[PDB]
Amino acid sequence: ARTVSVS
Amino acid sequence: ARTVSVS
Amino acid sequence: GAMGSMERASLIQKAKLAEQAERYEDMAAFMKGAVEKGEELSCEERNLLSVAYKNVVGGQRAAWRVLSSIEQKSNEEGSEEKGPEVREYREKVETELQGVCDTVLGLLDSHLIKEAGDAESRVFYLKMKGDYYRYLAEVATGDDKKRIIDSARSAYQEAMDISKKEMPPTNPIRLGLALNFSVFHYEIANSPEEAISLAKTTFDEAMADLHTLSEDSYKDSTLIMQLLRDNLTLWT
Amino acid sequence: GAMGSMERASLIQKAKLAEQAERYEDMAAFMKGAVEKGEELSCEERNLLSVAYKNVVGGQRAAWRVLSSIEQKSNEEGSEEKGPEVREYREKVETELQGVCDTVLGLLDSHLIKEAGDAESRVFYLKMKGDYYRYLAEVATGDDKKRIIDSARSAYQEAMDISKKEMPPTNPIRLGLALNFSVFHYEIANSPEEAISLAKTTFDEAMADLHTLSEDSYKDSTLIMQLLRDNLTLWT
Ligand SMILES: [Ca+2]
Ligand SMILES: [Ca+2]
Ligand SMILES: [Ca+2]
Ligand SMILES: [Ca+2]
Ligand SMILES: [Ca+2]
Ligand SMILES: [Ca+2]
Ligand SMILES: [Ca+2]
Ligand SMILES: [Ca+2]
Ligand SMILES: [Cl-]
Ligand SMILES: [Cl-]
């Protein structure tokens, strides 16, 4: 689990 | 399912 | 450039074909060519531009992180000297990544942003500007890291001010902007509390506006809200 | 070429780094540079060369099939005329694929194969020659399709004759050669019965030699045998 930006 | 070559 | 002799409509057609074939470098070159025709982009065309470059820079960012990690493990105590190759190759990848970011930023500056009057286009482009400065910031070390960070922040802030005045809290562009600005705070600006506050506030204001949406719009907004929730779960 | 000023050992080091970063185009350019130094390749180096180009051409083959399918659906009755873009873009991809195959075949011809004396290297290179002619055959239409097919067949046949004389039936290179030659028969040469016979015979002779192997060699051989079984299950 890591920080996500918009996909 | 399809024909496979060496991987 | 090399796409100067092709029709604008043909470039757009080929961009869609390249997307289907997962040929993102081709897709990016076609969309660059379409931008350089000088006409404003439609909503569909803006999204093609974004998809193409996101996939290109995505590959480069992932490679850079692999190589940076190897490089850092080489600079531990007890590690064996292996020569300049790791640094050299990390620099090559880094240079190519900076070249792609510079290309996107050049297109936004010449002249997508200045011609963009409607809120949906202007926020879209200003968000992109923030994102590509953020990607440059991920690899910056020297005496320009601070100026790059401030350029990212400034682009994001201007986009946020417009989005708050002109768009509903459930608008996917507004939501994606807020998500990426929160990532900026958390990973680049060393401001985790600012990141958490923005993500929470964004989520709660969207939640309270969902009642106004159709079934299809509902699905679009809640997808992005879920990404805000995922980050919050990790950060807190 | 452009890798002329880099040390052979550095090129090999960087090829391994590029593999870890999944930068296969870079990996292929590094290995091309290493080949052009003029020294024979080790077993490890041969496998790096093969991995790099297999991944590059793999991407191009997959794109070509997407585009070819779209092109064929455009040439049905009831389909709307959309202009030359699909054909043009399929041709671009096709040309780039042929350029990669031509590059590999050029390296094998100058001068990997002629310098290759041991069975393990000679069979490896002749198998590669067969594979890259087969890839060219997948996209050939005109009056050279038949000559390309015969070049593939001839390379595979020479490799098979050496492998049968010089290697055990469980040898992974021998097994992979037989697997790919059977794919040639089935998909390119329109000889499904020849494909089935070769796959079966290869499987059965390996099965009877497994008793001679260590635990690690056993695992290597049975992996490839499983691919022969998968094809046979599909073809019969
Ligand atoms: Ca025109
Ligand atoms: Ca040591
Ligand atoms: Ca640098
Ligand atoms: Ca305008
Ligand atoms: Ca030397
Ligand atoms: Ca019609
Ligand atoms: Ca052609
Ligand atoms: Ca020799
Ligand atoms: Cl390099
Ligand atoms: Cl084209």
Numbering used by the authors:
A (entry chain P), B (entry chain P): 1843 to 1849
C (entry chain A), D (entry chain A): -4 to 231
Task: Give passages from the manuscript.
Our model was applied to identify novel putative binding sites on biologically relevant 14-3-3 client proteins (FOXO3, Myc, BAD, Notch-4, CFTR and p53). The model was used to screen 296 potential binding sites and to select eight peptide sequences for follow-up assays. Experimental validation confirmed the predictive power of our model, with three out of eight newly predicted phosphopeptides exhibiting low-micromolar binding affinities to 14-3-3, two weak binders and two binders with marginal affinity. Structural characterization via X-ray crystallography further substantiated our findings, revealing binding modes consistent with known 14-3-3-client interactions. This includes an ‘open’ binding mode, where peptides bend out of the 14-3-3 pocket, an ‘extended’ binding mode, in which peptides occupy the entire 14-3-3 pocket, and peptides featuring a disordered C-terminus. The identification of such structurally representative 14-3-3 binding motifs, without having provided such structural information to our models, testifies to the strength of our deep learning approach.
